[PDB]
Design a protein around this ligand. Structure first.
Ligand code: SF4
Ligand code: SF4
Ligand code: FES
Ligand code: FES
Lengths: 216, 694
């Protein structure tokens, strides 16, 4: 389900002001420079993300400020912010849990992870806790299907999951330092087989300079 | 250059780069469609135009696939029929069973193309049901039932390309994609009603007409649009004595499938505050009276008062025929008067541009010539409120051509980039002998569009003298192939008025009138008519002029008579009666003939043929219907009427003011409309729904 209508609230309505900080305004000008001068509307996506990172969610005021910056009507920006699902148009928690439930992570155990998270936080996908700490959302494949099952907490991928590890991961993200991303408990590095690498076993690579053609 | 191709065995030829659907239309081959429109950009989302091309493996979209030489198309075979069936299956998957409660029933493309190119029964029986979609509030004119949306994108394309209203769009993604304003906003434009006609389903409908009638109940009369001097061609749909709706009609040289919102929605005023019986003022009250008694009272007033010469004043307003004005002028002259007058602010004096040559008060670079334009200057005109369809044409030209547009006047919220450069006559001369003057000189089709609000000024000679000098000095504005001096009229009767010579003497300009016959004249101010004068209002709605009157004669509206109307171009168009007038109302030239006979005179014509012959005797262009004539006297006209007698006038420094302070509520029929009242409360720039904070 995707929400495609806005109803004004006291904390999300166009009367609320918004302005990029000087840091983010410098970054936004650098972003506008990455496209032709007359096609500055192409920067609507990155600048909207800049706004969504300054203020924790893509509010209507952010869309209207971007529209003012890029000289485009606000509706063209509303369409972008509604099309792309990473623009959170409702307010969010500190940590946005994104659990993949596509077929690979399902075959390897995403539903145990979902059960564990729902039981720990007492929450359903699309809802937020009383703590404004965890917002839950079941997402499609996030591009870590070999290191499955998987999840993502606020832009960082925690992979090759177990219910145990997910529970205590949520525990330490609730309080204290959160572990570094990657596979759980370093049972793997990256896409290598977990028994170990079977392919790339040297300690110095082959330089292609040694294998060039007869020409060049 | 044309190419040749084959469609269902028939060889046809069109230009290269054209769409296949255009070839099929030229070949007489019928191809389905929901998202294609001849005037909108090509979208290929309905997937209903699919046809088979030998080149391509899959079936291709006729709307988008370019035409190529030697291509062979089939619109007949089993793949195409199965494709159409499948597409209609999916289209009617989530469509609501609203056909009884839908106002598009009987005139729905979905119904007809399901019957023709689709299945007999559906196979959708899912227990989870159909999709639902909430209704939007986009204003008091367009009613929304958005479960019926089939996501064609005609509304969006129209509003963003032809109208300049980018508030409508396509929010969401997938099956939950919803057309509308993402937040509650109004579709603020003077062209919004064409969205109702463009939607092939009933997702956007007329609100005042919401459930009034069905299409088969309606008589369809092809007539002409008063409410502007564009002369938009319209279809009046009538159910007996009641006019139910007005919709546009195809005329590519006038209005091109569109009409504005006044023309569409002021029909509500023809059934309220109408004049159905004559009235006599006995005091502070109006007393209903007969026709014999009212005309007797008028004759007794003429004989009691004894108005000598130019003391009889004839005022003609907007929305009046040519026949009525001709009869009123013949009567007024038979009574010894030359005080024929318009209801404009400076109507008591003749126009500064003169009426000697028709080129001086017409749109000489005809409405199809805006498409030829390279440079435009707008002097004292907001084309969005005066001839909005011509503003749409200007936009259309600006979007596909190098077109540089300037304006001298009030700063106008335009549907194009307009390059504002002043509000005074000083700035006009500055512009014309500075930069934009050379822009006009180097152009191959330049246009100087002057407004009628310039004629409604005292220092109008100053303007018209300046523009005339620039025209006769610059060849590009006036050649033997192109005239760029254009005067945009805002009311439908002024061109016919000036064509027949419905202007006053200067002897009459300074007379104080003793009798004032005011015909459809609702813009009078209570200062232009003396307190001791006998006044006779002749019209169809009681708004302003009938309050003043001492005698009121009910007339016929444009939906109740077959009249001749001259537009800005000089195009004479003939209307057609959809109904008869209400009650004891009459045709207006017949009223003037009767009151002539009651007075000491009599007009020499007795039926409509003799009136047509009199029109021919006055100006033969009034019977060459729908023909826009060239003129051989452009040089002569600019030298005689605009430049000659206007050097004596000195300019003011009063800034130019906007002419139409409210696009809605401009005339009697609109000021008697409640729909226009709602659309005036709404669609006000001070409201939050009508301004997007960009
Ligand atoms: S849009 Fe057409 S098919 Fe759909 S409910 Fe209305 S009349 Fe029926
Ligand atoms: S609202 Fe009507 S015109 Fe607009 S896309 Fe939907 S069906 Fe088409
Ligand atoms: S299937 Fe879960 S990361 Fe792709
Ligand atoms: S008419 Fe071609 S896809 Fe709609």
């Amino acid at each position: 389900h995707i929400v495609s209508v806005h109803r004004n609230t006291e904390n999300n309505n166009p009367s609320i002001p918004f302005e990029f900080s000087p840091e983010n305004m410098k970054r936004a000008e650098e972003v506008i420079a990455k496209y032709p001068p007359q096609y500055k509307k192409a920067a609507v996506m990155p600048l909207l993300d800049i706004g969504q990172r300054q203020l924790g969610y893509t509010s209507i005021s952010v869309m209207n400020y971007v529209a003012k910056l890029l000289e485009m009507p606000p509706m063209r920006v509303y369409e972008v912010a509604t099309f792309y699902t990473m623009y959170n148009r409702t307010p969010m928690g500190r940590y946005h849990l994104q659990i993949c439930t596509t077929t690979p992570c399902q075959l390897c155990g995403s539903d145990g992870i979902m059960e564990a998270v729902q039981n720990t936080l007492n929450i359903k996908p699309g809802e937020t806790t009383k703590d404004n700490l965890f917002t839950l959302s079941e997402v499609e494949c996030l591009g870590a299907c070999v290191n499955a099952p998987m999840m993502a907490i606020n832009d960082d991928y925690y992979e090759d999951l177990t219910p145990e590890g997910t529970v205590k991961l949520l525990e330490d993200c609730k309080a204290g330092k959160m572990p570094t991303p990657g596979p759980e408990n370093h049972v793997r590095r990256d896409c290598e087989p977990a028994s170990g690498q079977k392919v790339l076993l040297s300690k110095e690579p082959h330089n292609v300079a040694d294998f060039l053609q007869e020409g060049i | 250059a044309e190419i040749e191709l084959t469609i269902d065995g028939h060889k046809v030829s069109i230009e290269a780069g054209s769409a296949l659907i255009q070839a099929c239309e030229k070949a007489g081959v019928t191809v389905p469609r929901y998202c294609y429109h001849d005037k909108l950009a090509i979208a290929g989302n309905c997937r209903m135009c699919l046809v088979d091309v030998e080149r391509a493996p899959k079936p291709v979209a006729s709307c988008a696939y370019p035409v190529a030489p030697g291509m062979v198309v089939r619109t007949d075979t089993e793949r195409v029929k199965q494709a159409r069936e499948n597409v209609m299956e999916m289209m009617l998957q989530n469509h609501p069973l609203d056909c009884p409660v839908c106002d598009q029933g009987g005139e729905c493309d979905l119904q007809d193309q399901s019957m023709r190119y689709g299945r007999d029964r559906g196979r959708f029986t899912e227990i989870t049901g159909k999709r639902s979609t909430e209704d939007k509030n986009i204003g008091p004119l367009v009613k929304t039932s958005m479960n019926r949306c089939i996501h064609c994108t005609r509304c969006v394309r129209f509003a963003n390309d032809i109208a300049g209203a980018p508030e409508l769009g396509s929010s969401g993604r997938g099956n939950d994609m919803q057309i509308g304003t993402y937040l509650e906003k109004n579709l603020n434009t003077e062209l919004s009603g064409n969205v109702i006609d463009l939607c092939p389903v009933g997702a956007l409908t007329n609100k005042p007409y919401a459930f009034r009638a069905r299409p088969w109940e309606l008589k369809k009369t092809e007539s002409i649009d008063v409410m502007d001097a564009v002369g938009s061609n319209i279809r009046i749909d009538s159910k007996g004595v009641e006019v139910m709706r007005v919709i546009p009609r195809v005329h590519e040289d006038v209005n091109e499938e569109w009409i504005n919102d006044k023309s569409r929605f002021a029909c509500d005023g023809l059934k309220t505050q109408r004049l159905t019986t004559p009235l006599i003022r006995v005091g502070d009250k109006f007393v209903n009276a007969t026709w014999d008694d009212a005309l007797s009272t008028i004759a007794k007033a003429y004989q009691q008062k004894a108005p000598k010469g130019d003391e009889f004043k004839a005022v003609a307003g907007a929305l009046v025929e040519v026949e009525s004005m001709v009869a009123l002028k013949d009567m007024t002259n038979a009574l010894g008067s030359e005080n024929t007058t318009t209801d404009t602010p400076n109507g008591n004096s003749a126009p500064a541009h003169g009426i000697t040559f028709r080129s001086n008060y017409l749109f000489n670079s005809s409405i199809a010539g805006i498409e030829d334009a390279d440079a435009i200057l707008l002097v004292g005109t907001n084309p969005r409120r005066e001839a909005a369809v011509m503003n749409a044409r200007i936009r259309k030209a600006w979007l596909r051509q190098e077109l540089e547009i300037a304006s001298v006047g009030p700063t106008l919220d335009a549907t194009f980039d307009v390059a504002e450069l002043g509000n005074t006559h000083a700035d006009l001369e500055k512009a014309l002998s500075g930069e934009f003057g050379e822009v006009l000189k180097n152009a191959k089709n330049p246009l100087i569009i002057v407004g009628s609000g310039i004629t409604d000024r005292e220092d109008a000679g100053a303007f018209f003298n300046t523009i005339g000098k620039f025209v006769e000095s610059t060849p590009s504005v006036l050649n033997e192939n192109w005239n760029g001096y254009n005067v945009l009229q805002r009311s439908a009767s002024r061109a016919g008025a000036y064509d027949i010579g419905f202007t006053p003497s200067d002897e009459a300009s300074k007379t104080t009138p003793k009798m004032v016959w005011l015909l459809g004249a609702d813009e009078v101010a209570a200062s232009d008519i003396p307190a001791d004068a006998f006044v006779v209002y002749q019209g169809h709605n009681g708004d302003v002029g009938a309050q003043f009157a001492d005698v009121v004669l009910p007339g016929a509206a444009y939906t109740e008579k077959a009249g001749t109307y001259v537009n800005t171009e000089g195009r004479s168009q003939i209307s057609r009666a959809a109904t008869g007038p209400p009650g004891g109302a009459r045709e207006d030239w017949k009223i003037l003939r009767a009151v002539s006979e009651y007075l000491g005179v009599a007009l020499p014509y007795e039926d409509a043929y003799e009136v047509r012959d009199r029109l021919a005797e006055i100006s033969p262009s009034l019977v060459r219907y729908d023909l826009v004539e060239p003129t051989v006297f452009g040089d002569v006209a600019v030298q005689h009427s605009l430049v000659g007698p206007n050097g004596s006038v000195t300019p003011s420094s009063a800034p130019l003011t906007e002419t139409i302070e409210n696009f809605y509520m401009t005339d009697s029929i609109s000021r008697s409309s409640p729909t226009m009242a709602k659309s005036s409360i709404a669609f006000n720039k001070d409201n939050k729904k009508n301004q997007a904070f960009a």
